[PDB]
Paper text:
Although many bacteria use the T2SS to support secretion of proteases, VesC is one of three unique trypsin-like serine proteases found in V. cholerae, other Vibrio species, and related marine species, including Aeromonas hydrophila, and may have a nonspecific and perhaps toxic activity inside the cell compared to other T2SS-secreted proteases. Analysis of VesC variants and the X-ray crystallographic structure of wild-type VesC suggested that all mutations lead to loss of VesC production and/or function.
Optimized crystals that diffracted to 2.2-Å resolution were produced from the construct pro-VesC containing residues 23 to 522, which includes the propeptide but not the N-terminal signal peptide or the C-terminal GlyGly-CTERM motif. The overall structure of VesC revealed that it consists of three domains: an N-terminal domain with a protease fold, the middle domain with an Ig-like domain, and the C-terminal domain with a β-sandwich fold. Well-defined electron density maps allowed the fitting of all three domains, the protease fold (35 to 272), the Ig-like fold (273 to 380), and the C-terminal domain (381 to 511), with the exception of the N-terminal residues (23–34), including the propeptide and C-terminal tail residues (512 to 522), due to their flexibility in the crystal structure. Consistent with the structures of VesBPD and other trypsinogens, VesCPD displays a similar positioning of its catalytic residues, and the three disordered loop regions (residues 164 to 172, 216 to 220, and 247 to 249) in the position of the active site are also observed in the crystal structure of VesCPD. In contrast, two loop regions, residues 115 to 121 and 194 to 208, in VesCPD adopt substantially different conformations, which extend upwards from the globular body of the protease domain. In the crystal structure, the interface between VesCPD and VesCIg buries a 1,568-Å2 solvent-accessible surface, which is ∼28% larger than the interface between the homologous domains in VesB. The structure of the third C-terminal domain of VesC, which is missing in VesB, revealed a concave β-sandwich domain. The high degree of structural similarity between VesCCBM and CBM family proteins suggests that VesC binds to carbohydrates and/or target glycosylated substrates.
Numbering used by the authors: 35 to 163, 173 to 215, 221 to 246, 250 to 511
């Protein structure tokens, strides 16, 4: 019961696209001014200039009728880790003012409480994550305690059972990820949620609970403009500086108090400090300031330099900023030679490196509680094939494989077999992480990869 929508019914629909391209990757909504609301999982750590917005998206074969605007910055909730854990919310600051256009009204707690079991709600979208023309479909509200019991296998049941009140559920296509869900509150139409995760039976949609983010949402729209998340990718351990510019694109003063900067982790040798800060006090409409910091990365890990600046003007009390990094050393020549039959851009390793032993790449001797890491950075789409062999008396000594930061395989101690990973996607990263567990008592715990190949086709 998905009906095509009529132009004009939802002028605040937004579609997200790669810059100047006409292919929708996520949905969204217009909050007014220069701001669009979407899901964090749609945009987290992306370069904003890579993206466009189509306001009033309707027909994707006539995108002239929508207004294309470049994105200037992305703001993601400071608690967001993944869609299942919640806080799946983000705001995009557009480069310029849109043509006058109606904006969505955001739900507040009192509106949310009107919701009861089977209250109909409306979802709109093109069905991304399909339809060239916008559809709308009605769905029933499902209370969190019931939603939490959904699923028939570990993966879903675990995802559903871990839900919190930063999210809510409605009974199940049509919406895009990041897209809006509405309820007619008698106080009028309100956007209640954002499509976050989840024709399967008993698998309701999960949506970000916007009634619990009104303060964060208002803060983001005050107009402070800066690059909140920058991913540096792979970095060598060493000493660096970085500069961040803040601009007030709002109409009112924004007060900025004290400042913290630090590398996230437990290392005592990692460090960060302010080297220059012109943003203290009161930043004024149209004005800019800068924060420069030094940072020292010594532990090989995937972390981020965090900056926090307090603000009395902000209801949530502070401004967050991030510089993500994956600290690893370059694979030496022997290893690059070993992998030369792959079309890989770059190979990297941690401090307990995989190195060539005989016909195989093998984990370095590693202490309990540590891991041996190798990263294959920038492979084209296709399949990676390999043989693996793990040997440890400890059952929690295991090999974990990620493709583009998504977990894709686990391999158990004392087992050997051929495996294949599909790398969909234009540009791919494959990370091998052998974890010797905290309690592992086998000092010989190891893994070996051999027969490693790239196949550009996906069968046979």
């Amino acid at each position: 019961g998905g009906e095509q929508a009529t132009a004009g019914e939802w002028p605040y629909m937004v579609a997200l696209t790669a810059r100047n391209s006409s292919h929708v990757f996520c949905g969204g909504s217009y909050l007014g001014g220069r701001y669009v609301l979407t899901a964090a999982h749609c945009v987290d750590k992306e370069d904003p200039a890579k993206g466009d917005v189509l306001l009033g998206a309707f027909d994707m074969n006539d995108v002239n009728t929508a207004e294309r605007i470049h994105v200037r910055q992305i703001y993601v909730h400071n608690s967001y880790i993944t869609a299942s854990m919640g806080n799946d919310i983000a705001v995009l600051e557009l480069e310029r003012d849109p043509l006058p256009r109606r904006s969505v009204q955001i739900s507040d707690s009192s509106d949310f409480n009107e919701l009861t079991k089977d209250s109909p709600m409306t979802v709109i979208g093109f069905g991304n994550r399909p339809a060239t023309i916008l559809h709308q479909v009605q769905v029933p509200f499902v209370p969190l305690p019931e939603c939490k019991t959904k699923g028939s296998d570990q993966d879903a049941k675990n995802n559903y059972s871990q839900l919190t009140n930063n999210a809510f559920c409605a009974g199940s296509c049509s919406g895009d990820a990041g897209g809006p869900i509405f309820f007619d509150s008698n106080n009028g139409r309100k956007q209640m949620g954002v499509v976050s995760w989840g024709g399967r039976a008993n698998s309701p949609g999960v949506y970000t609970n916007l009634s619990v983010f009104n303060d964060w949402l208002d803060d983001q729209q005050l107009g402070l403009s800066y690059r909140q998340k920058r991913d540096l990718g792979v970095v060598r351990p060493g000493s660096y500086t970085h500069n961040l510019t803040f601009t007030n694109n709002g109409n009112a003063d924004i007060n900025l108090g004290n400042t913290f900067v630090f590398v996230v982790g437990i290392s005592r040798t990692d460090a960060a400090a302010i080297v220059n800060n012109s943003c203290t006090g009161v930043l004024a409409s149209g004005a800019s300031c800068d924060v420069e910091f030094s940072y020292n990365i010594t532990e090989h890990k995937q972390s981020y330099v965090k900056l926090i600046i307090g603000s009395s003007t902000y209801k949530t009390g502070a401004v967050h900023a991030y510089l993500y990094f994956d600290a690893l050393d370059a694979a030496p020549s022997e290893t690059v030679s070993f992998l030369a039959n792959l079309p890989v851009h770059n190979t990297h390793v941690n401090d307990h490196p995989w190195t060539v032993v005989g016909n195989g790449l093998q984990t370095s001797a590693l202490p309990a509680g540590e891991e041996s890491v190798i990263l294959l950075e920038n492979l084209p789409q296709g399949r990676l094939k390999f043989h693996y062999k793990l040997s440890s008396s400890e059952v929690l000594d295991q090999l974990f494989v990620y493709v583009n930061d998504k977990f894709k395989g686990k391999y158990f101690n004392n087992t050997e077999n051929l495996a294949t990973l599909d790398m969909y996607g234009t540009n791919n990263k494959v990370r091998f992480v052998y974890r010797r567990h905290s309690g592992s008592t086998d000092d010989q715990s190891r893994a070996i990869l051999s027969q490693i190949s790239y196949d550009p086709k996906f069968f046979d």
